[PDB]
């Protein structure tokens, strides 16, 4: 019935950058860039959504609900570390 998913936002996470040389034919090395938070750095933020797939249709909007963490976690930086479907109506 439902499709739950997480969205990660790495906008403020610093980028680690390093050269990748590739095949010998590549004249100029490329630079790989990855949002990677080192100790104490700005972290990705996360949002969790539950989509009701019963209404998905070409001319319908997506019915979705955002589930936010409890106040004791919402307070500061946090991570979503687990998801378990219990029944069709409980997550």
Ligand X SMILES: *[C@@H]1O[C@H](CO)[C@@H](O[C@@H]2O[C@H](CO)[C@@H](O)[C@H](O)[C@H]2NC(C)=O)[C@H](O)[C@H]1NC(C)=O
In the complex, the residues that contact ligand NAG under the rule CB under 6 A are: 9, 11-12, 58-59, 68
Judge contact between 20 and 31, C-beta under 8 A: yes
Q: CB nearer to a copy of itself: give 54 or 90.
A: 54
Nearest approach in angstroms of CB 71 to ligand NAG is: 8
Q: CB nearer to a copy of itself: give 2 or 35.
A: 2
Q: How far apart are CA 54 and CA 88, in angstroms?
A: 13
Report helix, strand or coil for 71. helix
Nearest approach in angstroms of CB 62 to a copy of itself is: 6
Q: How far apart are CA 9 and CA 65, in angstroms?
A: 18
Q: CB nearer to a copy of itself: give 46 or 67.
A: 67
Site string for ligand X, 1-30 (x = CB under 6 A): --------x-xx------------------
Judge contact between 35 and 44, C-beta under 8 A: yes
DSSP classification of residue 68? P
């Amino acid at each position: 019935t439902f499709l739950a998913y997480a969205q990660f936002n790495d906008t403020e996470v610093p980028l680690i950058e390093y050269s990748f040389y590739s095949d010998e034919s590549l004249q100029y090395p490329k630079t790989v860039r990855i949002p990677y938070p080192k100790a104490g750095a700005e972290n990705p933020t996360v949002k969790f959504f539950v989509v009701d797939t019963r209404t998905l249709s070409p001319n319908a909007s997506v019915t979705s609900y955002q589930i936010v963490p409890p106040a004791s976690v919402l307070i500061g930086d946090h991570y979503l570390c687990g998801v378990t479907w219990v029944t069709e109506e409980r997550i």
